[PDB]
Design a protein around this ligand. Structure first.
Ligand SMILES: Cc1cn([C@H]2C[C@H](O)[C@@H](COP(=O)(O)OP(=O)(O)OP(=O)(O)O)O2)c(=O)[nH]c1=O
Ligand SMILES: Cc1cn([C@H]2C[C@H](O)[C@@H](COP(=O)(O)OP(=O)(O)OP(=O)(O)O)O2)c(=O)[nH]c1=O
Ligand SMILES: Cc1cn([C@H]2C[C@H](O)[C@@H](COP(=O)(O)OP(=O)(O)OP(=O)(O)O)O2)c(=O)[nH]c1=O
Ligand SMILES: Cc1cn([C@H]2C[C@H](O)[C@@H](COP(=O)(O)OP(=O)(O)OP(=O)(O)O)O2)c(=O)[nH]c1=O
Ligand SMILES: Cc1cn([C@H]2C[C@H](O)[C@@H](COP(=O)(O)OP(=O)(O)OP(=O)(O)O)O2)c(=O)[nH]c1=O
Ligand SMILES: Cc1cn([C@H]2C[C@H](O)[C@@H](COP(=O)(O)OP(=O)(O)OP(=O)(O)O)O2)c(=O)[nH]c1=O
Ligand SMILES: Cc1cn([C@H]2C[C@H](O)[C@@H](COP(=O)(O)O)O2)c(=O)[nH]c1=O
Ligand SMILES: Cc1cn([C@H]2C[C@H](O)[C@@H](COP(=O)(O)O)O2)c(=O)[nH]c1=O
Ligand SMILES: Cc1cn([C@H]2C[C@H](O)[C@@H](COP(=O)(O)O)O2)c(=O)[nH]c1=O
Ligand SMILES: Cc1cn([C@H]2C[C@H](O)[C@@H](COP(=O)(O)O)O2)c(=O)[nH]c1=O
Ligand SMILES: Cc1cn([C@H]2C[C@H](O)[C@@H](COP(=O)(O)O)O2)c(=O)[nH]c1=O
Ligand SMILES: Cc1cn([C@H]2C[C@H](O)[C@@H](COP(=O)(O)O)O2)c(=O)[nH]c1=O
Ligand SMILES: [Cl-]
Ligand SMILES: [Cl-]
Ligand SMILES: [Cl-]
Ligand SMILES: [Mg+2]
Ligand SMILES: [Mg+2]
Ligand SMILES: [Mg+2]
Ligand SMILES: [Mg+2]
Ligand SMILES: [Mg+2]
Ligand SMILES: [Mg+2]
Ligand SMILES: [Zn+2]
Ligand SMILES: [Zn+2]
Ligand SMILES: [Zn+2]
Ligand SMILES: [Zn+2]
Ligand SMILES: [Zn+2]
Ligand SMILES: [Zn+2]
Lengths: 135, 135, 135, 135, 136, 135
């Protein structure tokens, strides 16, 4: 948990966030455990969806899209390693709904760089016993 | 998947719905794969939460409670082995939100007994490719 | 870890015993660990056998049939999951030979509902340091 | 397959049959899959049993002892790999009971050196679609 | 067959973890990717607990005890409880012949590398042993 | 660890050294952990390599040939179990190169029978933590 190591991880989240394909906001989220990146998620439409555009015609977000934290945890369910006891490097502070599942997933600590508009997500993670660090 | 085994799976879903401490609705969700129940999830408040009562007064559901699908999905993240290519036995038809993550998790089919008030998740499921059976 | 969840597992064991085609006695046994039902076995003929019938033409039990415990054990052998540390829910008390293999399997505890005429299997379990509870 | 690799596995069985303490008969059984020894078992008392001697005070076999094939299967259960689609190398042809479970496990083929007194184990193995080879 | 923006994202991840190498003659990184997950990030350096994390001797040449990024990547996979078989590799620098041997036997499908090393002969071993190679 | 079983592990390494197609020397390596053989490797050309002959016409060794230790190491990377905390049984003492990787892998101890021409490999193991016993 060396400051040089943690920076490389947060920079990895930022770098996978640049795949997002969304134009509103590009969000990334990786799962880190035992020196391994078990899942990297970013915001976008479901797999095999008829479009990878995240926006509607009024430029608002397609309700079908999944958050970064959503995709990361869903991917973990698809993987064969556990998410429990792992850490989470987000480019943005997570959504309150996502924070609910992140805590229930037994994630010990969530790292976020940028603060989203709304900040109740951080507040949910803390109530549910998950340590938070801004970097 | 003989139909006497399919029933046993579905009744197992109902058994674990009965241990839920929500009184608006008791919902259970089962993950089945290779002759194994990898996760049994029921609706309720997060782990270590101060109260295990899922209601507010108003008869309203506490915004912090997790769906039976959310829990089953999260436990699949929590543990090893994969939710991918598995089948889901629910007591009630799942909501739009969970049906998004279910499809992204590569769940082949969703088995549900009761149809909820609104049935958009059912039509969200087969629109994202997940097969759907009512029993 | 909870009495109602405990009662759910045992009632799941009874659900699967009813799937058995056997006429003499329908036995079920499931493998539980970390909230996951890793194996659920019931008595019957081996896979692909010419009959799913468990009895010969004189009413006695076919020597090719497997116990519920044998199947619960064998599926763990077919699994990519470990039976070591698991607990066992059976509708009946396992036979001396199954018990012999159950202890060697590293099963912490055996739950059982119906006491079987001849109870040496229980005795074998206690002897080999396996916790046993009737319910 | 290659001939000299085949002999290596079989004499490994004879090698581990020799670490058994039983005097009546020393049996060894190795499970092989994808060119890997996933389990090696021999006959003896359960783990942590008070004595490692397998004989009664009259030369008979303690009904508590495990067959080499039994330990090989139980070990596979504790293992985190599948015995399904594997090959088994025994020093002696297995008994009917183990033969039942061997077939149910999904064992492709059984290699054996010595042919036991009673040969109805090979019978059982063959009827259940398990190929057999003496070497 | 990998989407170009993701393929780029992994290769840059290898470059990020190569910056932790502590070696000063050349910083090497190696990523193990299977099923969209990064199972191992390895970089060149001394072994665990070694008296120095300094990779070089008094003359500017590499300490023989220094492990390659590819060695660390595969050793990690060995200690790791997942398989390296059927996975692909992201290297900042093309692997050496000795490592390429182990890489091939490890059942690695493909090797992406960004920097061509002075000596090609590592890539030769990869290609001849049926492991795909792509420079980017 | 028991003497009867420690020798069985060593002889197992020798059985697998005998399947090497190298006429220059025949080496074998066994990984043992929690009383189980996890990997077995010997010296030879890579898999699917056009020839299985380890030597050139000059008589010297083909540089494509892996040591018995690289094979045991790689097979462990291919494996789904962990090499860290295990013991390594070798027919001959490993080279310094393989010794570095052995040490980094967290191998507790290395049993060996024959010392190689060069004995530098042992010294490297000693220095890097790995315990060494000649047997
Ligand atoms: C591959 C991958 C996808 N995702 C997310 C991003 C998207 O929301 C969703 C998949 O997006 P889409 O990648 O674009 O996947 P696809 O199968 O539809 O491929 P294409 O659109 O090019 O035909 O899953 C991750 O979070 N992590 C990953 O590693
Ligand atoms: C054990 C278990 C929990 N859950 C869910 C239900 C709840 O929403 C959530 C937490 O349940 P809580 O069971 O009540 O567990 P707890 O750790 O909070 O213990 P207690 O509340 O008594 O102090 O976990 C499942 O969905 N399936 C399961 O098998
Ligand atoms: C599926 C399943 C089978 N078994 C056991 C019970 C039986 O003894 C054995 C084989 O059962 P049979 O289910 O009836 O399987 P089958 O393929 O032979 O049936 P069919 O020919 O009609 O397709 O497997 C379990 O113990 N648990 C399980 O979940
Ligand atoms: C370790 C091991 C044991 N067994 C079996 C053989 C025995 O019947 C049983 C127990 O082996 P023994 O281990 O040697 O008995 P133990 O566990 O009580 O140890 P000790 O007697 O020295 O106190 O497990 C195998 O079949 N394969 C193995 O690799
Ligand atoms: C942690 C880690 C180490 N390594 C390698 C790099 C090094 O060569 C080797 C050990 O590195 P050292 O990180 O420096 O670890 P250490 O236990 O010696 O701690 P310190 O030196 O600070 O006292 O393992 C990787 O390849 N990937 C990783 O994630
Ligand atoms: C199966 C196996 C192979 N190996 C190594 C030894 C060799 O160096 C390498 C390749 O062996 P090759 O046995 O000869 O196997 P192959 O896939 O090349 O088949 P073929 O007969 O056509 O050549 O694998 C081990 O170290 N341990 C093992 O258990
Ligand atoms: C808040 C939040 C937003 N996002 C993405 C989803 C949308 O495509 C993008 C634009 O934000 P908005 O649509 O919520 O205004 O934000 C995440 O991926 N994770 C989050 O936690
Ligand atoms: C719609 C839906 C509700 N539930 C739970 C949420 C609450 O625990 C309970 C009451 O829901 P309601 O408040 O939306 O009526 O139903 C599920 O578990 N799955 C579902 O799909
Ligand atoms: C003793 C025992 C019997 N059985 C089954 C075997 C047959 O299906 C049925 C008949 O047994 P019986 O012939 O010994 O009475 O009981 C089990 O499934 N598990 C057991 O432990
Ligand atoms: C038949 C058989 C016996 N054995 C063991 C049981 C005792 O350890 C020893 C003597 O068997 P017996 O006393 O049944 O003749 O042989 C096996 O390990 N595998 C077998 O298949
Ligand atoms: C060739 C090669 C070198 N390296 C490291 C060894 C030293 O750390 C550094 C200098 O290489 P050199 O000393 O072999 O020229 O590069 C790798 O990590 N992987 C490789 O494939
Ligand atoms: C030194 C060493 C050689 N070998 C093999 C390499 C060749 O197969 C054979 C000849 O070694 P050499 O050619 O390096 O003297 O011995 C090992 O398997 N392990 C070792 O540690
Ligand atoms: Cl998982
Ligand atoms: Cl298993
Ligand atoms: Cl591994
Ligand atoms: Mg897409
Ligand atoms: Mg609670
Ligand atoms: Mg049948
Ligand atoms: Mg003992
Ligand atoms: Mg260091
Ligand atoms: Mg070959
Ligand atoms: Zn969110
Ligand atoms: Zn829902
Ligand atoms: Zn029985
Ligand atoms: Zn037997
Ligand atoms: Zn190298
Ligand atoms: Zn070597």
């Amino acid at each position: 948990m060396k400051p040089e190591i943690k920076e490389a991880y947060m920079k990895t989240a930022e770098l996978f966030s640049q795949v997002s394909n969304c134009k509103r906001m590009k969000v990334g989220a990786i799962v880190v455990k035992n020196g391994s990146i078990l899942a990297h998620g970013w915001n976008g439409t479901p797999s095999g969806f008829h479009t990878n555009c995240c926006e509607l015609e009024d430029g608002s977000t397609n309700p079908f899209v999944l958050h970064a934290e959503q995709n990361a945890l869903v991917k973990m369910a698809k993987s064969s390693e556990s998410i429990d006891g792992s850490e989470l490097f987000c480019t943005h502070s997570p959504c309150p709904d996502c924070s609910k599942m992140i805590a229930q997933a037994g994630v010990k600590k969530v790292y976020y760089r940028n603060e989203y508009r709304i900040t109740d997500g951080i507040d949910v993670l803390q109530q549910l016993g998950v340590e938070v660090e801004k970097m």
